[PDB]
Design a protein around this ligand. Structure first.
Ligand SMILES: CC(=O)N[C@@H]1[C@@H](O)[C@H](O[C@@H]2O[C@H](CO)[C@@H](O[C@@H]3O[C@H](CO)[C@@H](O[C@@H]4O[C@H](CO)[C@@H](O)[C@H](O)[C@H]4NC(C)=O)[C@H](O)[C@H]3NC(C)=O)[C@H](O)[C@H]2NC(C)=O)[C@@H](CO)O[C@@H]1O
Ligand SMILES: CC(=O)N[C@@H]1[C@@H](O)[C@H](O[C@@H]2O[C@H](CO)[C@@H](O[C@@H]3O[C@H](CO)[C@@H](O[C@@H]4O[C@H](CO)[C@@H](O)[C@H](O)[C@H]4NC(C)=O)[C@H](O)[C@H]3NC(C)=O)[C@H](O)[C@H]2NC(C)=O)[C@@H](CO)O[C@@H]1O
Ligand SMILES: *[C@@H]1O[C@H](CO)[C@@H](O[C@@H]2O[C@H](CO)[C@@H](O)[C@H](O)[C@H]2NC(C)=O)[C@H](O)[C@H]1NC(C)=O
Ligand SMILES: *[C@@H]1O[C@H](CO)[C@@H](O[C@@H]2O[C@H](CO)[C@@H](O)[C@H](O)[C@H]2NC(C)=O)[C@H](O)[C@H]1NC(C)=O
Ligand code: NAG
Ligand code: NAG
Lengths: 189, 189
């Protein structure tokens, strides 16, 4: 990293390795190496992390694959709607559903100011025509499970997991917890 | 029916044949016969119906099969949550999900008065462990489609269709409309 100092840092709410790397001008993957983190997406609330501060040589790329912006304008299979929870924005939610902000706004012309949405407000999620998820069912959380990783493994999206578990905070999952998990969501025909 | 008079009646919001039969002391199936209704569950907003009033011989049973109270304490497959819309009660919603009011209250100990719930409030739906719906996907409404009938045909529940389409009023469906439809929801193993 060719850093000049290290801070020992307590992980707080909202943190990702991306936001921590930015705060301290470190690299995501430098923090992964130094702390022998098994999964770059998983850092625990209240854990301590040694952070190389002010790196000349930040490695933010070798260990993660950060997706391009969403380009699709619909989500395969489900759901018809999503309910807004604390901290959601339409930008946030369209990214989770892997669609453009634009497509989510277009599906929701009842919203006038796209920046003023209310906890408890229901929005339309634009579902691709002729599409489906192959199985939707119970899953028990195991140690280190995250919505972000479960989406990739089961070929669904963060948003679709959130919609099926709309009152579950992804940051407060417990080993053994039952969530509802959609699988293999795709266009059909 | 051995009725004493007939009223010509305009179907309004909230009406079912059950509520109309009660208002006028008729029978569900007498109204079905007289008006040659193809489906006892389907009456259209603003349609006129001849109602035999004050029947001595009301037939409420021959043409419909009215389900017993729900006895199950969980819903197979999905969803983790449901958002409250105008006119919902926990009694209403537990019936749609084919579970006991009791089981729905027990899953929701954050609710203190079970009779004071708010438009936009999210509740937990108790999903049976080790359960699933086999496919969840798009369906286009055809003439005469109803959530009540679609549940039976596709082996799901009114509540599960509502949860996947939480901003759709079941009384305002249009031919060609795309909804999200779960199928073949059951316990597994
Ligand atoms: C490189 C990068 O920036 N990637 C991000 C990626 O991190 C974002 O995903 C979010 O990551 C955060 C941090 O990992 C997740 O929050 C954690 O969630 C887990 C699970 O709920 C929490 O784990 C629990 O921790 C406690 C102790 O705190 C243990 O007792 C529990 O057993 C444990 N549970 C399990 C099942 O292991 C953890 O505390 C949370 N940490 C924080 C700081 O909140 C978050 O869930 C995750 N978000 C999603 C939607 O999955 C991702 C956002 O999409 O973007 C980039 O990929
Ligand atoms: C015997 C008995 O009491 N059974 C009840 C059963 O009726 C309850 O189910 C509810 O029935 C009502 C009345 O049929 C349903 O409301 C109707 O919904 C349809 C579909 O949205 C509306 O049809 C539309 O009507 C307009 C004209 O008004 C047409 O232009 C449209 O093309 C047409 N759409 C389609 C697809 O055909 C109709 O207007 C509504 N009528 C009224 C009075 O609102 C209602 O959806 C239905 N509820 C559910 C959840 O399915 C049932 C409640 O669960 O309990 C008993 O089974
Ligand atoms: C978000 O959407 C895009 C486009 O639909 C996905 O990207 C493609 O996925 C398929 C596999 O199903 C591949 O054939 C393409 O090569 C993928 N890559 C690209 C650059 O389009 C993308 O995976 C989706 N992202 C997430 C996180 O779900
Ligand atoms: C509500 O729940 C009950 C019990 O789970 C269902 O009743 C049974 O369904 C199975 C078929 O899957 C039959 O083997 C039983 O004989 C059924 N009858 C009875 C009286 O239990 C019931 O069908 C569900 N109702 C709805 C409307 O979904
Ligand atoms: C799925 O089908 C829709 C409807 O045409 C289309 O817009 C969309 O891009 C398709 N998605 C994928 C991933 O192929
Ligand atoms: C499904 O399994 C659950 C979990 O044991 C049980 O309570 C429930 O009654 C079962 N439902 C049916 C329809 O068999």
């Amino acid at each position: 990293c060719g850093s000049t100092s290290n801070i020992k840092y307590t992980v707080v709410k909202g943190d990702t390795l991306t936001s921590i790397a930015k705060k301290f001008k470190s690299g995501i993957c430098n923090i992964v190496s130094v702390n022998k983190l098994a999964n770059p997406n998983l850092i625990e609330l209240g854990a301590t992390l040694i952070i190389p501060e002010n790196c000349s040589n930040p490695d933010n790329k070798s260990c993660v694959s950060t997706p391009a912006e969403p380009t699709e304008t619909c989500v395969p299979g489900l759901p018809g709607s999503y309910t807004i929870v604390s901290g959601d924005t339409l930008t946030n939610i369209s990214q989770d559903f892997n669609i453009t902000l634009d497509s989510l706004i277009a599906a929701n012309t009842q919203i006038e100011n796209p920046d003023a949405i209310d906890v408890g407000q229901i929005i339309t999620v634009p579902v691709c025509p002729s599409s489906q998820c192959e199985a939707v069912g119970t899953y028990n959380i195991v140690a280190g499970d995250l919505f972000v990783d479960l989406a990739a493994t089961y070929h669904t999206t963060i948003g679709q997991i959130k919609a099926l578990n709309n009152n579950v905070n992804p940051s407060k999952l417990k080993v053994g917890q039952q969530i509802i998990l959609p699988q293999d969501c795709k266009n059909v025909t």
